[PDB]
Design a protein around this ligand. Structure first.
Ligand SMILES: Nc1ncnc2c1ncn2[C@@H]1O[C@H](COP(=O)(O)OP(=O)(O)O)[C@@H](O)[C@H]1O
Lengths: 134, 342, 334, 197, 350
């Protein structure tokens, strides 16, 4: 298992004929946009996001990594993929493999945060209603 | 199996925090869902019924109605959809996950400008729809999968208190004394009727099954798919109507009352038909059973609740996907749900 | 009784009515705020102020393009950090800078990932030790006896900080990845050469005071790296505090006392308002029917008036300190 | 040579063949032999176009893209194409069992994982099969490798290389693994990470 | 009667709320007991199955195995009752009475003592003695006294953890997460023999009981084996294989035989496409199921499939149950029950 194929030791592991001519080289690379889209579609499936009005944005096909945007979840997935791409582009990590760690961690954190804050929203509104009624 | 009447006493009593506004029986499991007047939804197991299986604060005002459908997809796993409409001008659509005993929210439907009074959910092929009506006098149709409206129409001058769905038709019962049959996918009104003295609380199709009012009397009605419906209002009276046949959208023609059932001392709050028998409840703290063939009261449950009975649940007997279990549920003001098993 | 109480509670009626009217906007902006907060925690741990600003601009642009509303006045601290957290963190020795506070909330809300703290001054060692008070173990990757002491800390549940994080030893890899064996009623971890029970109260921090060090890929990709470094405003604040304590200590003490007392007053008044709404909520009947509830709400209003009066009176002196502060901005800048 | 042997195994352990299935298997093995080493997307697209052109030139079939050819021995007794949905469901169930028995890892299953698990299984079914996984961190290399080795009943060996260790310990670890492979007939998957060098 | 094979379709479909972990038929009444993955136990009538007769949340994690015994304690003149024994991932075994006059699960007691999930539990009765045996992921096999409610015997037959046990007379045969069976004499706790030949962990092992009739593998081959009481056993594994083994004969506590310490695989059955999850022998037929949405009826005389129920479940088939044709106190009814991953069980009758 090699993470950085440009490192000196990893380059030796790849170019050394003792290993090259015997092992099957399987280029895992990194996640593409479609894989990120599928993972996100699984992650945010349980988040109660559809509680507001949503107007389908007008965007170009090259800006959509999912099926055509219909729901808020589609927009959230596209926003997250675009932000991760822009983060790596602007941080200028060279041609390093794009580790999906940030994307995964952000997805988990977003699920947890949205759950908690939506709960707070509903409970606060209920208490306010009861007070006014009394 | 259908020729079954509950006993005088419930098998199970379930207490909740406040008044019960709606109750629905899980279509395949011994689970009862209770929607109360404080915006909460409970899931109880009938054999472990003291501590609820699930307790959800879904809305911020009272729940006015709810409906349940178990999906039948032709390709994609099936699951139970629960639709809850409240005074918050919102309809929340949830998935029941029996594996975690939790209400997983799928989405919410927005668009009505006042209190939503009724909802209905049904499926065509792999398409699932949700119809509803509210105090804004509007009846709206949403696509389940898409999450936004599909159709809108207004059948009455007064606001619609309840609706029912059969085929591609809707009878809407108004806050007025009238009831109206409209063609669902066009909004074209087809028939009108009156006869009541006060606002209609319930209205629903009578489905044909293998009985006096549950078979087509002509091949025209057999081809149409429906001939009769039933409604009840605050005039203490239950009325069974013949549905006129349009120029088969269909082109228009009045409802004709074919049988009048009386006996309640107060407002009729629920209609439910199981085989040969009509079950109903009133704001006189009683549930009652009439014979559908002769139009007589067969059995009376007096003093079933110390408050006013709000809702009944009995299984569908006109669907191949529903097992007609010998189980009936009642729920009312006094923070009680009475479940009659066998 | 009833008329007097409702007249007194008319203020809460007005505030409650405004809150429920703003409910619609509050619900509309929730998803955008959650996205911003999650991204801010995930990506901005190792960024400076300018970089965070740029990335927030990019994220707001993406939110605009894809029709997700958000609070245009969003602030990370105001959205996620509460008064109790602020007061306890400052009491433990945290700096008053906004940058340090943001990083502090980020590192404290790292529930899933082992935090890796870069602090050239080793301030956060002191802050964390004060926060947990005791049962805090300081290990190092650069010393002998590491494995056994970490094993005991795991078994008993102490809060461990491992110093010299640039010398990370992969022998503890299974802790970084949190790859535990859920052995029936127990949770265990394989470390060193054997299986060790995880008490569940055990918490791990890795710390380095060597900026631009060397974090290997395995640890770097699996930790939440947060930088705790100084900036302009921290330097200016420290310079002014030194200037004030040297020149005029009495105003220093009065300023600190006023700030602390007003913050405590604000916390008390907030919690009192919360209690008022909860007590009115759980009435078990009409307010007139429940006389004890009427008495309770009257007493709560009296307490609120006293607290707010104290804060309002104490605040009147703070512009004097504002002018005193402006006297030394010259030294600050230079 | 590898391609030859690849084709042989598929015919030898497969069901009754048709010309269409034979050509599709040939394309699948072509993907495994030549294309798995390609890095960029343009190169993969060019390889797919090359397969179409070669087939039209010599073997005049349906879609033979990289993700359209899922040959597997996991879901059946012979080595044949499988439905994507069935394989996803099977992998999810077996992965839940794997989490319960070996190690809980809450990772999401997607199509790329299914392609990678099939090729890793292919590699670990070969005589003297060895493979080298190159890609970004936290993409699922090690855990997916462990899951495949668990499916095929291999003992997983991960050398405990750490600071203050040297080639003596590494030699001892390799010697133990070698001795167990030979004298105890222990089928072994030895995972060497670049960080262990 | 023993020639009966189930029809190609279930006689009835029974729905439950989640995955079925085990099923057992009530030995005398038309009642089926179903234990699921959430710690719940259910009793259903087989003529009115649309509403459960009863249910009980006893454990808190998944039930891993259930066994049932109807007592026959004639000398005391006591009321005989069905004892239902369940074991779970909660490191516990629970023992219940079935109260047929109330149709409820009345808990009798609980047995503690394991350090990990229990993978099998069995209950059997001597003239007036009832015992409960279990094996678990802690690698130990423990036998408790039913009436007294505390451990009688403990032993460790495998270096890996034990997955399935069966008991015949005074012997226990245990399959493990390792690929080797072991036969041990339980009263003295002395291992006697081992059976190697599987490639993957063992899912089930069961004795093959003699039938008073002729059947290929249900009759002794010598006077020694006849007097011993056992000739063959059957096991199934995750290598898609079911093996019929010839048991070695120790010197008759029994003495391990220095030259006959190994089992001899006499027949191998292949045809399942996945892990074999259950096995059961009725008459001349071996019924089994796998993680391939299918059940198979095998002819024990030749080792071939006779009939196959394909796509019987939409998920993995987890459990089978047939009646006992080698016990005078059990009527071999024309009944089969299958239960599986899809939150369903199928009952075949008549
Ligand atoms: N498909 C996925 N879904 C969710 N998380 C993943 C996925 N693939 C990898 N991960 C993350 O990466 C880690 C597992 O991958 P791993 O085999 O450890 O990669 P490596 O060991 O090569 O760095 C976990 O931390 C996990 O959360």
């Amino acid at each position: 298992t090699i993470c950085d194929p440009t490192n000196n030791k990893s380059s030796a592991m790849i170019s050394s004929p003792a290993l090259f001519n015997r092992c099957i080289i399987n280029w895992m690379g990194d996640w593409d946009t479609k894989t990120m889209s599928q993972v996100a579609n699984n992650m945010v499936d349980v988040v109660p996001m559809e509680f507001t009005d949503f107007i389908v944005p007008e965007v170009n096909k090259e800006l959509v990594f999912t099926e055509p945007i219909q729901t808020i979840r589609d927009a959230v997935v596209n926003i997250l993929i675009h932000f991760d791409r822009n983060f790596y582009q602007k941080m200028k990590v060279g041609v390093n493999p794009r580790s999906p760690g940030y994307f995964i961690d952000g997805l988990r954190a977003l699920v947890k945060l949205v759950t908690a804050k939506y709960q707070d929203l509903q409970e606060n509104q209920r208490f306010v209603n009861v007070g006014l009624e009394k | 199996v259908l020729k079954w009447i509950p006993r005088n006493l419930p098998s199970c009593l379930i207490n909740v925090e406040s008044s019960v506004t709606s109750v629905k029986l899980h279509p395949n499991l011994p689970i009862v869902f209770v929607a109360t007047d404080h915006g909460k939804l409970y899931a109880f197991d009938l054999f472990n019924y003291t501590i609820p299986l699930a307790s959800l604060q879904s809305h911020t005002k009272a729940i006015t109605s709810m409906d349940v459908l178990f999906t039948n997809y032709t390709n994609k796993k099936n699951y139970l959809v629960i639709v809850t409409a409240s005074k918050d001008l919102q309809i929340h659509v949830f998935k029941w996950v029996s594996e975690e005993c939790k209400f997983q929210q799928i989405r919410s439907l927005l668009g009505h400008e006042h209190i939503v009074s009724a909802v209905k959910i049904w499926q065509k092929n792999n398409d699932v729809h949700i119809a509803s009506c509210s105090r804004d006098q509007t009846v709206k149709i949403w696509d389940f999968h898409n999450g936004w409206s599909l159709k809108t129409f207004q059948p009455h001058s007064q606001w619609v208190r309840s609706i029912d769905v059969l085929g591609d038709y809707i009878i809407s019962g108004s806050h007025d004394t009238t009831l109206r049959l409209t063609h669902w996918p066009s909004g074209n009104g087809l028939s009108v009727g009156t006869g009541h003295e006060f606002p209609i609380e319930k209205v629903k199709f009578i489905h044909f099954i293998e009985i006096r009012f549950r078979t087509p009397s002509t091949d025209r009605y057999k081809n149409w798919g429906m001939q009769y419906c039933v409604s009840a209002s605050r005039d203490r009276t239950i009325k069974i109507w013949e549905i006129p046949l349009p120029t088969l959208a269909p082109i228009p023609s009045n409802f004709r009352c074919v049988l009048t059932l009386k006996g309640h001392l107060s407002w009729v709050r629920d209609i439910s038909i199981r085989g040969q028998y009509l079950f109903s409840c009133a704001d006189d703290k009683s549930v009652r059973c009439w014979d559908l063939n002769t139009g007589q009261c067969l059995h009376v449950w007096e003093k079933l609740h110390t408050g006013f009975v709000n809702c009944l649940d009995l299984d569908v007997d006109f669907d191949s996907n529903v097992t007609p279990r010998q189980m009936m549920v009642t729920g009312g003001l006094d923070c009680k749900s009475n479940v009659f098993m066998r | 009784r009833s008329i007097s109480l409702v007249k007194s509670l008319t203020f809460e009626k007005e505030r409650w009515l405004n809150t429920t009217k703003q409910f619609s906007k509050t619900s509309q902006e929730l998803i955008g705020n959650c996205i911003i907060s999650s991204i801010y925690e995930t990506y901005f741990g190792h960024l400076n102020e300018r970089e965070r600003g740029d990335m927030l601009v990019i994220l707001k642009r993406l939110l605009g393009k894809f029709a997700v509303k958000y609070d245009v006045n969003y602030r990370f601290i105001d959205y996620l950090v509460t008064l109790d957290e602020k007061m306890k963190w400052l009491e433990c020795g945290l700096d008053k800078n906004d940058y340090f506070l943001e990083n502090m909330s980020i590192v404290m809300n790292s529930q899933d990932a082992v935090p890796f703290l870069l602090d050239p001054s080793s301030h956060m060692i002191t802050v964390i030790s004060n926060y947990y008070g005791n049962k805090t173990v300081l290990l190092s990757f650069l010393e002998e006896g590491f494995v056994k002491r970490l094993e005991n800390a795991v078994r008993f549940g102490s809060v461990v900080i491992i110093q010299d994080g640039e010398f990370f030893d992969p022998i503890i890899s299974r802790l970084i990845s949190r790859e535990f064996n859920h052995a029936g009623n127990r949770v265990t971890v394989e470390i060193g050469d054997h299986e060790v029970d995880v008490s569940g109260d055990f918490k791990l921090f890795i710390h380095s005071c060597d900026p631009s060090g060397d974090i290997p890929i395995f640890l770097r990709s699996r930790v939440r790296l947060v930088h705790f470094v100084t900036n302009k405003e921290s330097i200016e604040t420290r310079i002014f505090d030194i200037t004030l304590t040297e020149e005029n200590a009495e105003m220093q003490r009065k300023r600190e006392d006023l700030i602390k007392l007003n913050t405590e007053y604000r916390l008390k008044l907030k919690n009192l308002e919360k209690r008022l709404l909860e007590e009115l909520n759980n009435s078990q009947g009409n307010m007139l029917e429940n006389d004890e509830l009427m008495v309770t709400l009257n007493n709560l209003k009296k307490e609120a008036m006293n607290i707010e009066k104290k804060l309002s009176e104490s605040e009147e002196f703070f512009p004097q300190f504002d002018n005193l502060v402006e006297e030394y901005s010259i030294i600050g800048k230079h | 040579t590898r391609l030859v042997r690849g084709v042989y195994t598929a015919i030898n352990t497969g069901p009754r063949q048709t010309l269409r299935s034979l050509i599709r298997l040939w394309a699948y093995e072509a993907w495994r032999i030549f294309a798995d080493r390609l890095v960029g997307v343009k190169e993969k697209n060019s390889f797919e176009q090359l397969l179409y052109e070669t087939v039209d030139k010599y073997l005049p079939l349906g879609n033979i893209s990289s993700t359209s050819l899922l040959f597997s021995g996991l879901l059946s007794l012979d080595f044949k194409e499988v439905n994507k949905t069935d394989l996803v469901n099977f992998i999810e169930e077996r992965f839940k069992t794997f989490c319960d028995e070996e190690l809980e890892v809450p990772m999401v299953i997607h199509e790329s994982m299914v392609d990678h698990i099939l090729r890793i299984d292919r590699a670990l079914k070969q005589v003297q099969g060895h493979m080298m996984l190159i890609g970004a961190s936290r993409t699922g290399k090690t855990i997916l490798t462990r899951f495949v080795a668990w499916l095929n009943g291999l003992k997983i060996v991960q050398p405990k290389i750490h600071r203050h260790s040297n080639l003596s310990d590494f030699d001892m670890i390799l010697k133990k693994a070698i001795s167990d492979c030979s004298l105890k007939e222990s089928r072994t998957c030895l995972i060497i990470d670049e960080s262990n060098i």
